[PDB]
Amino acid sequence: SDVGGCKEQIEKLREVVETPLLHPERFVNLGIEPPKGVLLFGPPGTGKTLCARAVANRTDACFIRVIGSELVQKYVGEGARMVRELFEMARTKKACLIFFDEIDAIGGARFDDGAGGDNEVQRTMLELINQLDGFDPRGNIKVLMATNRPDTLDPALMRPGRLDRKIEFSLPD
Amino acid sequence: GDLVGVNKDSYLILETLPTEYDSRVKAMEVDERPTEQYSDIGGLDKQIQELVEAIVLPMNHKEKFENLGIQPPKGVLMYGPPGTGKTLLARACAAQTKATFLKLAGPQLVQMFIGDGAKLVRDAFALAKEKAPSIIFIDELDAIGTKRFDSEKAGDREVQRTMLELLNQLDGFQPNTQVKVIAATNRVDILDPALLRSGRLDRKIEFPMPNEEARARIMQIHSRKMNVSPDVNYEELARCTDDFNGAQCKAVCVEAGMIALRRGATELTHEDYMEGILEVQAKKKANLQYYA
Amino acid sequence: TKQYEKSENDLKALQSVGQIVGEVLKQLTEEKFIVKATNGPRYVVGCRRQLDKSKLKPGTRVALDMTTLTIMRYLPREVDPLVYNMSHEDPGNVSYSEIGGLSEQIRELREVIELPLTNPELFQRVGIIPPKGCLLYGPPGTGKTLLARAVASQLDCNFLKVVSSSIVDKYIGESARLIREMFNYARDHQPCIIFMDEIDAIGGRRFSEGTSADREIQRTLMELLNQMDGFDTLHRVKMIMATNRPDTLDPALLRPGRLDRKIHIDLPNEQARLDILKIHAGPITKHGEIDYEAIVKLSDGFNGADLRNVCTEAGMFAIRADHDFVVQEDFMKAVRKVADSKKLESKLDYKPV
Ligand SMILES: Nc1ncnc2c1ncn2[C@@H]1O[C@H](COP(=O)(O)OP(=O)(O)OP(=O)(O)O)[C@@H](O)[C@H]1O
Ligand SMILES: Nc1ncnc2c1ncn2[C@@H]1O[C@H](COP(=O)(O)OP(=O)(O)OP(=O)(O)O)[C@@H](O)[C@H]1O
């Protein structure tokens, strides 16, 4: 009931996440196959609140939200363990949702002369995409993503293979 | 050696037990076989032959090479933006060669502690020599093989030493001529010049956007499981795809079924396809005005 | 039947437990000896009557009793990683004759390496000190590790190989002191040759102070640096260093002493290119009609490794034609095309001096 009048937006993102887990036998019957996930961004109204909608509309099993800046840490090599473990946890969590906020912080692309710099950043993003492109399962836990600007190109060029359904705000008509 | 069994305070070794160590470092990843096969791709028939060659030819034709004095390739550089889709093809051909396949990710060499990646690579080719013949695959080599410029230092520098220790393994040691290893990068922007060798990267192919003929067939192999109305042009979509990718075509085949739910049609239609094309690409949205 | 009983009687001797290793620090008196286990604790203890006080001496590895904590038997020395370093195998001999260029570089290293060992007398007359170190770097061209490795198998004698991955040692970077062990047995087993590959990782410049292990490596230098600024005679032993670029070596290693000489690899000359071509045409089967100069003219600026990769690719192109004997026409096809592709992948090949 907290929606601000957006109709096609909220609908098209409802069918990517809530309907597959609401009626799994339906899409499996008529499959084809549900999509992997979505991407949110644009003007601030309304960033990040649309996810709260999935929180209240979650049917049974709770889902996990993740803050972006905690991936990158001092003493490089902590993010490697970080990003890896939550995946295994999710696979035990049987279809539980994982959402990263402000991917633009850890999505710094691509290369500069010197000095790195982006090396410790590129590890985070690229290990993310590599572990996202694994074949087992992978991963049944679906995906959910949100940020501010469409940058950068590397994540933006890697998503359309593994992701779909990028919508733009809209924003009040 | 090590692992020798000795009992508490007795300090006597009863037996010497093999082999090596340890847990995930011993076995990175156990890949039974991928489900995909080479029949799921199209338009790569010219460039898939160069990939299939370097891996298959050493296996069966060793008897031919001893007569012809031929040295088989080892590493092969496959690279491009998705897709392409190099990963799936390279893996799929590994089920057909029956050789043992070990999944390995590039950034895994980076660890919280020092010297881990070095020991890890040594431990990787260990069981590769034990499991010979076998196949090891790595991805995002460009990320862990950036040598920057000015010291000091590079965070990856321990992984550059580990990579240069790998190349050094193919340098000072001949036995690395067994158990081929495949590498793939998303972008050749940063590449180590030292990777040019028969045992290092040798076969190199630049993978552009798929041809129209290919984009038509690949989506048909993707939607061959789906129920489709027996009216499609195939030419239409192929011509209507610029800067598109083969994986974008899968996204289009799913988009066609996404609105089929609100359509109610149990069978997919021609117009649904082009609809889904214009949907996700190109971007959005604004409105049709000023163009009369 | 009775041999089994011999083994079982050996078990009766296995009922005697081992002992703990320890180093002799000093002796306070003849009834008081200061010993230190490898673990860190120190102990003032006695000794039995089989050992001699003069033979013991401080800094000697000995075995202490499990309870009395006194010396029973001793050992002169031991080292566990080195045995691996003495197992390196380099083919040739023949491989030494097949490398070709660079001739005069080889004629420099042959001398600086081999002569001080065979004729030490010539050096003492003139008053010139034998060079105790040398620097061979690439890859402007290639052939660094090969050539030096060939010298290991040509000069025979002793050779020791160390991979640059042995310096870290995870926590406790004691491998720095393992360098002192290395030079210990280098002073015992002398003469010997030591190789150092990819020194840029372990000899960097600590320009930007940061992270953690950046510093520990600077401490490994101090072992190299102080042992080669000794206080020690490295004249009998020999060392070889190699890198991508002499940018990180610091004024410490670019200074003589540690690195007396420097030999850069150069791109193979077309005259040398004909040579290296020749040695790869031998094992290969070709048609009776052959012309190597076509390849030499068509292939310019390539690396000696890249030439061999091109010859192998010419042969690996013949298997598609399935022919047993292969003409050089098919060769020049595969050569020209694939080699030029190598030029497209040849970006950022320019390396500093
Ligand atoms: N030219 C093509 N022929 C056949 N299938 C393709 C082609 N291009 C893309 N695909 C399909 O797109 C899907 C997504 O693969 P994608 O391109 O994301 O993998 P990838 O790029 O190899 O991953 P990575 O970037 O980690 O290497 C695959 O299932 C593949 O079948
Ligand atoms: N002069 C030569 N004669 C024969 N083979 C050579 C020669 N130079 C290089 N090679 C080939 O190159 C390979 C590696 O030798 P080398 O140590 O020069 O490479 P590298 O120095 O590691 O190259 P880079 O420095 O670019 O990594 C060998 O397997 C060998 O077959």
Q: How far apart are CA C128 and CA C151, in angstroms?
A: 23
Q: Look at residue A14 and give its three-state secondary structure.
A: helix
Q: How far apart are CA B280 and CA B252, in angstroms?
A: 8
Q: Quick one: which of B234, B154, B166, B241 has its CA closest to B197?
A: B166
Chain A residue numbers with beta carbons less than 8 Å from the beta carbon of C211 are 75-76
> Which H or E run contains A30?
helix A24-30
Q: Look at residue A41 and give its three-state secondary structure.
A: strand
Residue C242, by phi and psi: left (phi above 0), alpha (psi -120 to 50) or beta? beta
Q: How far apart are CA C327 and CA A116, in angstroms?
A: 50
SS (H, E, C) chain B: CCCCEECHHHCCEEECCCCCCCHHHHCCCCECCCCCCHHHCCCCHHHHHHHHHHHHHHHHCHHHHHHHCCCCCCEEEEECCCCCCHHHHHHHHHHHHCCEEEECCHHHHCCCCCCHHHHHHHHHHHHHHHCCCEEEEEECHHHHCCCCCCCCCCCCHHHHHHHHHHHHHHHHCHHHHCCCEEEEECCCCCCCHHHECCCCEEEEEECCCCCHHHHHHHHHHHCCCCCECCCCCCHHHHHCCCCCCHHHHHHHHHHHHHCHHHHCCCCECHHHHHHHHHHHCCCCCCCCCCCC
Q: Look at residue A70 and give its three-state secondary structure.
A: helix
For residue A141, the 8-state DSSP code is S
Q: How far apart are CA C159 and CA C86, in angstroms?
A: 6
Q: A158 near B143, Cβ under 8 Å?
A: no
* Token representation of residue C106: 């080889």
Q: How far apart are CA B113 and CA C170, in angstroms?
A: 6
Strand ranges across the sheet with C134-137: C159-162, C193-196, C238-241, C134-137, C261-264
CA distances to C97, C100, C274, C279 from C94, rounded to whole Å, are 5, 11, 18, 10
For residue A47, the 8-state DSSP code is T
Amino acid in the structure at residue C192: C
Residue with tokens 């002799």: C24
Q: Which of residues 67-126 of B touch C (CB under 8 A)?
A: 67-73, 77, 113-116, 118-119, 122
A133 Cβ under 8 Å from any chain B Cβ: yes
Q: How far apart are CA B54 and CA B50, in angstroms?
A: 7
Q: How does C205-223 read in b/e, with b if 16+ C-beta sit within 10 Å?
A: bbeeeeeebbebbbebbeb
Q: How far apart are CA B279 and CA B285, in angstroms?
A: 10
Q: A68 near A105, Cβ under 8 Å?
A: yes
Q: How far apart are CA B222 and CA B249, in angstroms?
A: 9
Q: B99 near B207, Cβ under 8 Å?
A: no
Q: How far apart are CA C116 and CA B203, in angstroms?
A: 45
Q: How far apart are CA A79 and CA A146, in angstroms?
A: 20
CA distances to C31, C43, C235 from C28, rounded to whole Å, are 8, 12, 37
Q: Look at residue A55 and give its three-state secondary structure.
A: helix
Top residue of C66, C87, C165 to mutate, by most chain B CBs within 10 Å, is: C165
The DSSP bridge partners found for residue C42 are: C36
Q: Nearest residue CA, atom 19 of ligand 1?
A: B85
* Token representation of residue C203: 């000899």
Amino acid in the structure at residue A62: C
Q: How does B13-37 read in b/e, with b if 16+ C-beta sit within 10 Å?
A: eeeeeeeeeeeeeeebeebeebebe
Q: How far apart are CA A123 and CA A107, in angstroms?
A: 10
User: Cis peptide before A115, with omega less than 30 degrees from 0?
Assistant: yes
| Torsion of the alpha carbons at B175, B176, B177 and B181, rounded to the nearest 10 | 150
* Token representation of residue C82: 């080195």
* Distance from Cα C165 to the centre of ligand 2, integer Å: 21
Nearest ligand to the CA atom of B201? 2
* Token representation of residue B59: 């296996």
Q: C177: how many CB neighbours lie within 10 A of its CB?
A: 13
Q: How far apart are CA C114 and CA B144, in angstroms?
A: 40
CA atoms within 13 A on the CB side of C279: 16
CA A19 to chain centre: 17
End-to-end CA distance of chain A: 18
Q: Nearest residue CA, atom 1 of ligand 2?
A: C99
Phi, psi of B232 (to 5 degrees): -145, 150
Q: How far apart are CA A165 and CA B281, in angstroms?
A: 10
C211 Cβ under 8 Å from any chain A Cβ: yes
Using alpha carbons only, give the angle B99, B100, B102 rounded to the nearest 5 degrees.
135
Amino acid in the structure at residue B56: V
Phi, psi of C331 (to 5 degrees): -60, -60
Amino acid in the structure at residue B27: A
Q: Nearest residue CA, atom 10 of ligand 2?
A: C305
Residue with tokens 């390849």: C295
Top residue of B258, B263, B279 to mutate, by most chain A CBs within 10 Å, is: B258
User: Nearest chain A Cα to C208, which residue?
Assistant: A115
Q: Quick one: which of C245, A134, A69, A14 has its CA closest to B137?
A: A134
Q: How far apart are CA C25 and CA C31, in angstroms?
A: 14
Tell me if C161 and B73 make a contact (CB, 8 A cut-off): no
Strand ranges across the sheet with B75-79: B100-103, B134-139, B181-185, B75-79, B201-206
CA distances to A60, B264, C24 from C34, rounded to whole Å, are 71, 91, 6
Tell me if C208 and A75 make a contact (CB, 8 A cut-off): no
* Token representation of residue C186: 């280098």
Q: Look at residue A122 and give its three-state secondary structure.
A: helix
Q: Look at residue A40 and give its three-state secondary structure.
A: strand
- Chains within contact range of chain A (3+ C-beta pairs < 8 Å): B, C
Residue with tokens 């396809």: B273
* Token representation of residue C50: 């089989």
Q: How far apart are CA A2 and CA B256, in angstroms?
A: 30
CA distance B95 to chain A (A): 14
SS (H, E, C) chain C: CHHHHHHHHHHHHHCCCCCEEEEEEEECCCCCEEEEECCCCEEEECECCCCCHHHHCCCCEEEECCCCCCEEEECCCCCCCHHHHCCCCCCCCHHHHHCCCCHHHHHHHHHHHHHHHHCCHHHHHHCCCCCCCEEEECCCCCCHHHHHHHHHHHHCCCEEEECHHHCCCCCCCCHHHHHHHHHHHHHHCCCCEEEECCHHHHCCCCCCCCCCHHHHHHHHHHHHHHHHCCCCCCCCCEEEECCCCCCCCHHHHHCCCCCCEEEECCCCCHHHHHHHHHHHHCCCCCCCCCCCHHHHHHCCCCCHHHHHHHHHHHHHHHHHHCCCCCCHHHHHHHHHHHHHHHHHCCCCCCCCC
Residues 6 or more apart from C16 whose CB is under 8 A from it?
Answer: none
* Distance from Cα B70 to the centre of ligand 2, integer Å: 18
The DSSP bridge partners found for residue C26 are: C34
Q: How far apart are CA C154 and CA C118, in angstroms?
A: 14
Q: How far apart are CA C131 and CA B23, in angstroms?
A: 47
Nearest ligand to the CA atom of C243? 2
* Token representation of residue A85: 């473990």
| Whole-number CA gyration radius for chain A | 17
Q: Nearest residue CA, atom 30 of ligand 2?
A: C305
For residue A39, the 8-state DSSP code is E
Q: How far apart are CA B259 and CA A168, in angstroms?
A: 19
Q: How far apart are CA B68 and CA B58, in angstroms?
A: 13
Q: Is the CB of B186 under 6 A from ligand 1?
A: yes
Q: Which of C18, C283, C305 sits opposite B197 (nearest CB)?
A: C305
Using alpha carbons only, give the angle C257, C260, C265 rounded to the nearest 5 degrees.
150
Q: How far apart are CA C214 and CA C253, in angstroms?
A: 18
Q: How far apart are CA B73 and CA B93, in angstroms?
A: 16
Q: Quick one: which of C162, C8, C28 has its CA closest to C83?
A: C162
Q: C243 near C200, Cβ under 8 Å?
A: yes
Q: Is the CB of C244 under 6 A from ligand 2?
A: no
| Torsion of the alpha carbons at C270, C271, C272 and C277, rounded to the nearest 10 | 80
Q: How far apart are CA C310 and CA C99, in angstroms?
A: 16
CA distances to B91, B99, B214, B228, B249 from B220, rounded to whole Å, are 21, 30, 10, 10, 10
C212 Cβ under 8 Å from any chain A Cβ: yes
User: Nearest chain C Cα to A115, which residue?
Assistant: C208
The DSSP bridge partners found for residue C116 are: none
Best substitution site from C96, C142, C302, C342 to test ligand 2's pocket, by max atoms within 8 Å of Cβ?
C142
Q: A22 near A61, Cβ under 8 Å?
A: no
A112 Cβ under 8 Å from any chain B Cβ: no
Q: C248 near B190, Cβ under 8 Å?
A: no
Determined by cryo-EM
Q: C265 near C220, Cβ under 8 Å?
A: no
| Torsion of the alpha carbons at C131, C137, C142 and C148, rounded to the nearest 10 | 30
Using alpha carbons only, give the angle B124, C303, B90 rounded to the nearest 5 degrees.
40
CA distance C30 to chain B (A): 30
> Which H or E run contains A168?
strand A166-168
Q: B201: how many CB neighbours lie within 10 A of its CB?
A: 26
Q: How far apart are CA B109 and CA B106, in angstroms?
A: 6
For residue A69, the 8-state DSSP code is G
Residue B100, by phi and psi: left (phi above 0), alpha (psi -120 to 50) or beta? beta
Q: Look at residue A83 and give its three-state secondary structure.
A: helix
* Token representation of residue C19: 């002992």
Q: How many residues appear in chain B? A: 292
| Torsion of the alpha carbons at B261, B264, B268 and B274, rounded to the nearest 10 | -70
Q: Nearest residue CA, atom 5 of ligand 1?
A: B41
CA distance A37 to chain C (A): 36
The DSSP bridge partners found for residue C34 are: C26, C44
* Token representation of residue B157: 């520098």
Q: Is the CB of B247 under 6 A from ligand 1?
A: yes
Phi, psi of C171 (to 5 degrees): -70, 155
Residue with tokens 């009557």: C49
